[PDB]
CSV table of C-alpha atoms and ligand atoms in Angstrom, one decimal:
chain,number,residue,atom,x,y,z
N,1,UNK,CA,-67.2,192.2,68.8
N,2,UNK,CA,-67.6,192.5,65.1
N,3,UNK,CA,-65.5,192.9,61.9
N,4,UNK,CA,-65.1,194.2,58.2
N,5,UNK,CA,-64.8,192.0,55.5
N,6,UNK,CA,-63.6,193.9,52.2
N,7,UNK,CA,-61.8,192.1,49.7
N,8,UNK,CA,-59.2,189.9,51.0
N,9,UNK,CA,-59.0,192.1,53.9
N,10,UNK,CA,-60.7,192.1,58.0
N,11,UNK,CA,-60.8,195.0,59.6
N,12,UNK,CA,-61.6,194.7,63.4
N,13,UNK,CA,-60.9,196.8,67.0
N,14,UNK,CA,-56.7,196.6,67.5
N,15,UNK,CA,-58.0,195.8,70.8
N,16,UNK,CA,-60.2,192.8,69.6
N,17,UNK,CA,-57.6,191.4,67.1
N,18,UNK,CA,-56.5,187.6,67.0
N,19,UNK,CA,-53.1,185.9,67.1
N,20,UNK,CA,-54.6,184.9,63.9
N,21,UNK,CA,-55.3,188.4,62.7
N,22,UNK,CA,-51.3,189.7,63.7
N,23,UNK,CA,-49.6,186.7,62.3
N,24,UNK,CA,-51.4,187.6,58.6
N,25,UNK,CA,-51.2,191.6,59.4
N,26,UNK,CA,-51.5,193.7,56.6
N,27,UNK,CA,-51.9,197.6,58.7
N,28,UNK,CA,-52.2,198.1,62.5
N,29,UNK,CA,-52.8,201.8,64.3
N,30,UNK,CA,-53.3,202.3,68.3
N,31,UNK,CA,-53.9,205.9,68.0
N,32,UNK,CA,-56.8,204.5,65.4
N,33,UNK,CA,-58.1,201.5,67.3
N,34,UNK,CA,-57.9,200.0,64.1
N,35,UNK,CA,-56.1,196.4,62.8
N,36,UNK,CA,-56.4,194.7,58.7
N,37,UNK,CA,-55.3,191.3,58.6
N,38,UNK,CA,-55.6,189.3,55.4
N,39,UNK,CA,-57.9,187.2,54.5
N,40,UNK,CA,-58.2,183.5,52.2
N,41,UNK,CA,-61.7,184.2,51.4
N,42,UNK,CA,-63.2,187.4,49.8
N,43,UNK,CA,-65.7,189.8,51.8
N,44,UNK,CA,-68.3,191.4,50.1
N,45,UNK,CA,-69.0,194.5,52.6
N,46,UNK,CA,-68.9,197.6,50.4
N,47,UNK,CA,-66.9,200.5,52.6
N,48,UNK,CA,-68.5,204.1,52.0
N,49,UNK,CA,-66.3,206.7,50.2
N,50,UNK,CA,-68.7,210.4,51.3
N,51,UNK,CA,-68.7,212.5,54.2
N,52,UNK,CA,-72.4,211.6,55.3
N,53,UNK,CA,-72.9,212.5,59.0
N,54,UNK,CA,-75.7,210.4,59.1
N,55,UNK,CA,-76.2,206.2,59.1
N,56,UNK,CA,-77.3,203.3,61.3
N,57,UNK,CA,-74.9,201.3,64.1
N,58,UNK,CA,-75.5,198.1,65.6
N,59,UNK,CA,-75.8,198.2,69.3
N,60,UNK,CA,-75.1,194.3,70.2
N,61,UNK,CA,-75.9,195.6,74.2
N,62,UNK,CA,-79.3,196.2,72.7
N,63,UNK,CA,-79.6,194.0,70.0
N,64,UNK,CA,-80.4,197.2,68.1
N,65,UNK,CA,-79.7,199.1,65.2
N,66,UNK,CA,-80.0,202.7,65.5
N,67,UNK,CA,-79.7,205.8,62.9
N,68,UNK,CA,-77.4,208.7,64.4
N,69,UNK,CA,-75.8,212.0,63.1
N,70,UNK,CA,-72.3,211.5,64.0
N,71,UNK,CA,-69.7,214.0,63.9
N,72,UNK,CA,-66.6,214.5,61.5
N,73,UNK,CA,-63.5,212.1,61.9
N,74,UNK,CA,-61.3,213.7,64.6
N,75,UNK,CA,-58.1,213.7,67.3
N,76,UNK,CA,-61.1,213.2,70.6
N,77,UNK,CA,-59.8,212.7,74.6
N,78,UNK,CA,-61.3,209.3,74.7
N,79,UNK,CA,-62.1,209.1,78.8
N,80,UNK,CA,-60.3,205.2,80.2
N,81,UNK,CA,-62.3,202.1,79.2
N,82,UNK,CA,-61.5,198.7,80.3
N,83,UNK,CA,-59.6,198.6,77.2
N,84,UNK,CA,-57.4,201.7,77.1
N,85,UNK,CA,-56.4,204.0,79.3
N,86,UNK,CA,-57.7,208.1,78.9
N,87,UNK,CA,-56.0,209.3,75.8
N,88,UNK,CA,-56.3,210.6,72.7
N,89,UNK,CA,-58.1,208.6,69.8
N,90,UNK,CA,-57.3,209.6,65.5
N,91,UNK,CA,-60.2,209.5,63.1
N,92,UNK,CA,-63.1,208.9,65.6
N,93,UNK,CA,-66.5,210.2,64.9
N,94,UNK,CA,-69.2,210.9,68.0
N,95,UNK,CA,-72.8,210.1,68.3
N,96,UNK,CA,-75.6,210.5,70.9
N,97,UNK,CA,-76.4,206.9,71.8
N,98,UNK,CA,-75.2,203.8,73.5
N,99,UNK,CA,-71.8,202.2,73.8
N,100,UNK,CA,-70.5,199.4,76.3
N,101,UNK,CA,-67.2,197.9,75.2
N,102,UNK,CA,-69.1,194.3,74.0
N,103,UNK,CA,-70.8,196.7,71.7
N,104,UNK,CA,-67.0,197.6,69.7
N,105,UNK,CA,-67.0,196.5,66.2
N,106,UNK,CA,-70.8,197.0,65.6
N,107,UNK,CA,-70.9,198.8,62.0
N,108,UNK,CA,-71.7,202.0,61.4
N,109,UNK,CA,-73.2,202.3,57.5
N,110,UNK,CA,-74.9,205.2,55.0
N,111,UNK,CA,-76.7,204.9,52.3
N,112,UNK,CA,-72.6,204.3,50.6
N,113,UNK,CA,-71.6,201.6,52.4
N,114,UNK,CA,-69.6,200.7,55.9
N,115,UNK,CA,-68.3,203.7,57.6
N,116,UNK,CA,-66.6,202.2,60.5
N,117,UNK,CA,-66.8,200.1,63.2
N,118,UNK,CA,-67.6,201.3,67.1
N,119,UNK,CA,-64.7,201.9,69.1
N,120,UNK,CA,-65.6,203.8,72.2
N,121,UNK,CA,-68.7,204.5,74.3
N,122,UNK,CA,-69.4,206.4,77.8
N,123,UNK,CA,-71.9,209.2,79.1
N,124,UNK,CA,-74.1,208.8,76.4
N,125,UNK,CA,-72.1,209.1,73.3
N,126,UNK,CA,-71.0,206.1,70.6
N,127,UNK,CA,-67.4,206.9,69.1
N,128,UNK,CA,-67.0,205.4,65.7
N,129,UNK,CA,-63.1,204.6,64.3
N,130,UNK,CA,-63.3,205.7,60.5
N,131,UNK,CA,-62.4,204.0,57.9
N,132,UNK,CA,-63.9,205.8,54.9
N,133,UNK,CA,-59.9,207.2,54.3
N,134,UNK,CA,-58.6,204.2,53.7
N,135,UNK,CA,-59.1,204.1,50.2
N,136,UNK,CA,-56.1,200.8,49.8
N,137,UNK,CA,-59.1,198.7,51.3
N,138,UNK,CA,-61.1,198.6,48.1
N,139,UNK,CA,-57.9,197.2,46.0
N,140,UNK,CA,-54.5,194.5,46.0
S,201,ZN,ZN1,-72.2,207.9,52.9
């Protein structure tokens, strides 16, 4: 489990998100893994705007935060998780390192902020869903 707070926005795992979070939605995408709903209270996490390929997740399977090089956001064949069937996953960066499905919505963070949350995990890589595009998170 495990969230974004930006603004008046959360961003968590589509897969994860609330009644609570769809009744105040503000952006949803499957291919993505990603939901924003909108929130009373302002968040003070900073989102990175770069292209680092390096940071430090939180493994909550671990209780572990770990520094990784992680690949650039890409269309990936995500193999089936007790959450979605094999498919293809948008904007999802890779890492060496461990991911069990508790572990989605850990942060992933640089030296510029929150780079995304964890998304999908299995034989020995940690995917990452991006959100350093989505620029609209940082205003409104
Ligand atoms: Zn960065």
């Amino acid at each position: 489990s495990g969230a974004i707070y930006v603004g008046n926005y959360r961003v968590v795992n589509r897969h994860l998100a609330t009644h609570n979070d769809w009744a105040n939605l503000v952006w949803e995408d499957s291919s993505r893994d990603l939901l924003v709903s909108s929130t009373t209270a302002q968040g003070c996490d900073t989102i990175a705007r770069c292209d680092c390929q390096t940071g430090v997740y939180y493994c909550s399977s671990r209780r572990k935060h770990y520094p990784v090089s992680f690949s650039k956001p890409s269309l990936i064949f995500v193999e089936a998780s007790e959450y979605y069937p094999a498919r293809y996953q948008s904007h999802l960066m890779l890492a060496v390192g461990h991911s069990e499905p508790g572990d989605c919505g850990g942060i992933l963070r640089c030296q510029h902020g929150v780079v995304g949350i964890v998304s999908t995990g299995g034989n020995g890589l940690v995917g990452f869903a991006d959100v350093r595009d989505l620029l609209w998170l940082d205003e409104e």
